[PDB]
Structure formats: C-alpha cells, structure tokens
C-alpha cells in the first residue's frame, strides 16, 4: 500500500553511476513494481518493470532488481547521460486494486563534464533594436554556480546544459538582462561570482 522514494533530487555528473532508491510495502504476494520516466513536455512512460524476486531487468542501460526480502526496487545505471535528466517515479500495482501507487518522484539532474572550460561573458544585441541587449555567461565548468540576482529589475537565469555529441559544443550557460539604463553585464556577472580567467570583453 505504499511506495517510498527517499530522495527528491539527485544531481550527478555524466558518466557516473545512477542509483535511485525505491522501497515499498504491500501485503500482496502478487505485487508488480515499475519505474516510470517523465521527460519535459512528455507524458510519463514505462522505463522497466518486474514482479520476479532477484531477477535483473534492464532497459536502455537502466536496470533494477526486485528484492522482496528488503522490499526494494532500486533504479540503477552504470553511466549517466545528459539525456537522462528527467523525473523518475517508482510504482506499485497489487492484484486487489485498480489503482497504481506512485512514489513522490525523484528528479535526476545530470550535469556536464567540461573538459576544456573557457568561461566568458558576452553581450548580445537585439536583432531588431540595437537598444536592447542580453548578457551571456558561457563555457564555464559545472562547478561554477549561477545564483539568482538580488536586484529587482535584473533577471538572471539558472544554468542551462547544452548536450552535444561534439565535445567542443557541450557547454553551460546562463543569461542576464535588465531594462535599467544603468545596467552593465558586470552588474549581473560580477568578479566575485565568475572565474578569475573569465574572458570578459568590453562591449
């Protein structure tokens, strides 16, 4: 009658192993366990499933083994990939029920390994009005953290991880902008929050 996913968020660098915990409780002998994956702007869909004690089940590098003795069905993958970032639900179906019980979900955030960081802050002009611009902080390693702005009329986005088969193009970036006429890119990406070697050209 219950499904527990003890971790709400897992952040992990690509290439490292995935372990998403799931335990359950049921009085039923006929109990069916599932993992569902939920990508952005898609509906939940089956990842894998099993009712067989100690049988490894696998789908596209993900695998799980039901262990009835520890009421567990942990989701594993040897090497995380950026395309694995998603919400993952563990679920339970019992023969006496029409409902499936879903755990609270675990968000998996896979972050990039940046072999050759080249941190830089660039200023980009609006294609329609040379008045408006945005600031682009890019090519920094995944240890660099981008915090929200303190200023009310300054907007700063979270880091976005661009997944690319070409190593050269795999890169992190954040964007900042403001309607204030006082605004300069260094007001958003100041020297204390960007790496010392940031390439920071004058606009």
């Amino acid at each position: 009658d219950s499904v527990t996913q003890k971790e709400g968020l897992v952040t992990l660098t690509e290439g490292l192993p995935v372990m998403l915990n799931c335990t359950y409780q049921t009085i039923y002998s006929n109990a069916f366990l599932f993992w569902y994956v939920h990508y952005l702007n898609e509906s939940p869909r089956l990842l894998l499933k099993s009712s067989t004690d100690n049988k490894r089940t696998e789908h596209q590098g993900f695998h799980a083994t039901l262990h009835k003795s520890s009421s567990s069905f942990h989701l594993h993958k040897s090497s995380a990939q950026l395309s694995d970032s998603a919400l993952y639900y563990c679920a339970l179906s019992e023969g006496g029920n029409y409902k499936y019980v879903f755990g609270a979900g675990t968000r998996l955030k896979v972050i990039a390994h940046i072999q050759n960081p080249d941190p830089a802050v660039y200023q980009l002009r609006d294609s329609k009005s040379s008045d408006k611009s945005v600031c682009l902080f890019t090519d920094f390693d995944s240890q660099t953290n981008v915090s929200q702005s303190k200023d009310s009329d300054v907007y700063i986005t979270d880091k976005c991880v661009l997944d690319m088969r070409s190593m050269d193009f795999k890169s992190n970036s954040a964007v900042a902008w403001s309607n204030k006429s006082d605004f300069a890119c260094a007001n958003a990406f100041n020297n204390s929050i960007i790496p010392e070697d940031t390439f920071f050209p004058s606009p």
Partner: protein, 241 residues
C-alpha cells in the same frame, strides 16, 4: 497512440468547471482510468471505471471530480469548483493490474484570473563577435518575456526546419517579480551553431514561442488584445564576417 485526450490545456477561473474527454483507440486496453498530478508532481489515482454508465465522484484539495465511462471507448471527467491547477492523465491498461499502464497526452489545468493573462513578447539576440573570435562558435539567445501563466513551448527553426542540436532552453521560467503570487514570467533559450554557419547571410533563424492562453469561448472585455493561445516569434538572418 492508444489514447486521444482533450483538451490539452485550459485556463479555469476560480470555482468554474471544465470537461475532459478520453477516447480509447485500441480495444485491447479497456481498463481506463484518470490520474491527477498535483503541483508538487505527485501522481494520484482518481478513478477506474470499467462499464458503460459507471459514474463516480471524488473530492481532493483543489478540485471536485465527476467521472463517467460513457461507452466502451469513451471516458469523461468533469473538473469543478476548481481552486488549484493540476494535470490530469487518462490511462489505459490491458488488465486491471499486473500490466503496463499507458498514459495519455494529458490535460494541464491552471486556475487564475483571466484578466491577468498576457502572451509573451519574444526577441532574438545576435551572437557576439567576441564569442565568434574567441571560440569559432556563435550562440543566439531567445528571450520570451512578460507572459502569464507560465505554459509556453519554445522551439528554434533554422531555414524553416525545427532544430534540436545546439539548443538549450531553461527547464523552468523565471518569475519577473518572485515576491508576487501572480508575477509574470520570462524564459530564455540558446541556439549554438558554428561561427561559419552564423556568418552565412543566407541562413535564417527563428525562435518560436507557443503560448497557451484564453479560449475563444472566454468573453474578453478589456482594451488590449485578447490573450488567446497563439504563437509569437522573433527572427534573425546570418551576418557575414
């Protein structure tokens, strides 16, 4: 596709109601259900109605529900007295248990004041010459700003074809005023291409933002454009070196 679920989105004013419909396209999966997903992303079963004429009601925080199995292939849901948004999924399975559960495309419901709905303004920002010089790459940035509620889909189109390689779009919009419970939102996206591709003035780049807004059925009485579901785009052509 096993299920057709409609509508895909609706803005519902507080206390009002909306009808959802799910059509089963394959009789081998006759076990039809409704699930909700709350704003904390928790999925919860609501109803499984197997026989034509079956009807049942249920109340959860934020919505009253009335579900009907109308025919062997039609399941309906009325969501009423709404006070909080949620996503509803029709599901189907071959047996009542022990089989794969299949999810329909879903219905996202948002509860708000219709007079506060605003489509995005959209702008494309051209790659920095310094980035091109420093990296031999060119990042275009798209900004969607001032929209409410937060349900947009952003896509990039290069020479008339949607592209995915090189695209990074914020997973969540940001609140322009995080202290307001009805702040408008912004969303950013990047499209990164080779410098030589951007430097070709024959190449055309477009950022497209699909906004989900009011229905034509909602009466609008304000002196600004009616903020119905619509596409807002911005574009740029490549620029030679």
């Amino acid at each position: 596709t096993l299920l057709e679920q409609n509508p895909r989105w609706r803005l519902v004013p507080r206390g009002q109601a909306v009808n959802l419909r799910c059509i089963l396209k394959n009789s081998q999966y006759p076990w039809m259900s409704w699930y909700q997903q709350d704003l904390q992303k928790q999925l919860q079963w609501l109803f499984t109605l197997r026989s034509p004429g079956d009807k049942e009601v249920k109340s959860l925080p934020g919505a009253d529900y009335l579900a009907t199995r109308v025919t062997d292939t039609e399941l309906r849901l009325q969501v009423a007295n709404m006070s909080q948004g949620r996503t509803l999924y029709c599901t189907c399975s071959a047996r009542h248990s022990a089989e794969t559960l299949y999810f329909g495309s879903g219905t996202r419901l948002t509860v708000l004041d219709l007079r506060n709905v605003f489509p995005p303004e959209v702008a494309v920002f051209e790659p920095s010459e310094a980035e091109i010089s420093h990296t031999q790459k060119a990042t275009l940035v798209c900004l969607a700003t001032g929209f409410y509620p937060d349900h947009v889909e952003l896509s990039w189109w290069v020479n008339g074809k949607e592209v995915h390689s090189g695209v990074c779009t914020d997973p969540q919009p940001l609140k322009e005023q995080p202290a307001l419970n009805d702040s408008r939102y912004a969303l950013s996206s990047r499209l990164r291409v080779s410098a030589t591709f951007w430097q070709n003035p024959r190449n055309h780049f477009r950022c497209q933002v699909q906004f989900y807004g009011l229905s034509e059925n909602d009466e609008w009485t304000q002196d600004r454009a009616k903020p119905v579901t619509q596409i807002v785009s911005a574009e740029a052509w490549g620029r030679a070196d």
